[PDB]
């Protein structure tokens, strides 16, 4: 399959950030300020199978992440914090496909 954005839960992390539907998500990487000399270190993963996304959301462990994605063809990077759910306690962003 292919990982495409469809729905955005209002008020959820991505909604507070600015993710709009219909985006192609390429990469998910570690977030937060990096130490000098290590900005270009690769820790993230270039995604394609949509489950690689949700896998890399469980790896997030509630820590901030960057998303390198496509807006009508141009590359754009947005970073956010997955929120701890008050029910079963799972990190979410609010990103329906």
């Amino acid at each position: 399959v292919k990982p495409v954005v469809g729905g955005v839960k209002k008020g959820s992390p991505a909604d507070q950030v600015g993710i709009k539907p219909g985006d192609l998500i390429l990469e998910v990487n570690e977030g937060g300020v990096a130490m000098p000399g290590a900005e270009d270190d690769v820790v993230g993963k270039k995604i394609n199978t949509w489950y690689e996304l949700v896998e890399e959301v469980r790896k997030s462990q509630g820590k901030a992440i960057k998303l390198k994605i496509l807006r009508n063809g141009k590359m754009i990077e947005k970073e956010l914090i997955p929120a701890k759910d008050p029910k079963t306690g799972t990190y979410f962003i609010g990103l329906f496909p």
Partner: antibody, heavy 117, light 110 residues
Framework: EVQLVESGGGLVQPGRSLKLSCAAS????????MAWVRQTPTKGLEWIAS????????YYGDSVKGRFSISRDNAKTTHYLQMDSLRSEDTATYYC??????????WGQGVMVTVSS | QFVLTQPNSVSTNLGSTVKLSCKRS????????VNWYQQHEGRSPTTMIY?????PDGVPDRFSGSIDRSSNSALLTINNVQTEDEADYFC????????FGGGTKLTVLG
């Protein structure tokens, strides 16, 4: 398996220069920045310098006023610390350390620089 | 830009829990990651904790990290401390520069 093997230390006179080497292997060298960090019993750990994965951005610690320059030879999977105008107080054990965005994930075995006449 | 202060030494007992603190002098501690390194006598450092609270593979699960923003301090907790844990422990963070604490020497009597 990850290996960081340092070489190039020893004894140097005050006012002279010494270049250090750190031979890396066991991981994709060009995917990660590198750093040099020194240690003494009296001053603890002091960060010395870092160089980015693409070699195009360099970072110096405020313990050395530009006297040291850092370089990496990606074909030899190595990186270098050029130490100029050496001072008695620069005597220390020098480590190289691989970076992963936010921490030093592996350290070399160390080589010792002694500034003495 | 900031300094990280560690006790000079801590003495604890085989099997005890022990907490090692690391206090940031200026700027909010949560504003950048804290890491922890173990160094045995005469040996190279190895990672105990990185990214505030993640445990490298190979490290026993009796180590854990946390951040106490109210005291601007990072904490290394060792449960069920073992004699093999005698070592120096350095905390580490960064911002515009890279900063180490002065190191705590852990002694375990008993």
């Amino acid at each position: 398996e990850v290996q960081l093997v340092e070489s190039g230390g020893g004894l140097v006179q005050p006012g002279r220069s010494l270049k250090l080497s750190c031979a890396a292997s066991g991981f994709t060298f060009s995917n990660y920045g590198m750093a040099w960090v020194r240690q003494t019993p009296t001053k603890g750990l002091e960060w010395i310098a870092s160089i980015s994965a693409g070699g195009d951005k360099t970072y110096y610690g405020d313990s050395v006023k530009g006297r040291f320059s850092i370089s990496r030879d990606n074909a030899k999977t190595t990186h270098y610390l050029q130490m100029d105008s050496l001072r008695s107080e620069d005597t220390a054990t020098y480590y190289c350390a691989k970076t992963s965005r936010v921490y030093f994930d592996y350290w070399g075995q160390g080589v010792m620089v002694t500034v003495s006449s | 830009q900031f300094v990280l202060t560690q006790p000079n030494s801590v003495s604890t007992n085989l099997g005890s829990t022990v907490k090692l603190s690391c206090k940031r002098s200026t700027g909010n501690i949560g504003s950048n990651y804290v890491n922890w390194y173990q160094q045995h006598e005469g040996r190279s450092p190895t990672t105990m904790i990185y990214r505030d609270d993640k445990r490298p593979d190979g490290v026993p699960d009796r180590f854990s990290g946390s951040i106490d923003r109210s005291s601007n301090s990072a904490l290394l907790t060792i449960n069920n401390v073992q004699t093999e844990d005698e070592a120096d422990y350095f905390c580490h963070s960064y911002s515009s520069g890279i900063v180490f604490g002065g190191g705590t020497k852990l002694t375990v009597l008993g």
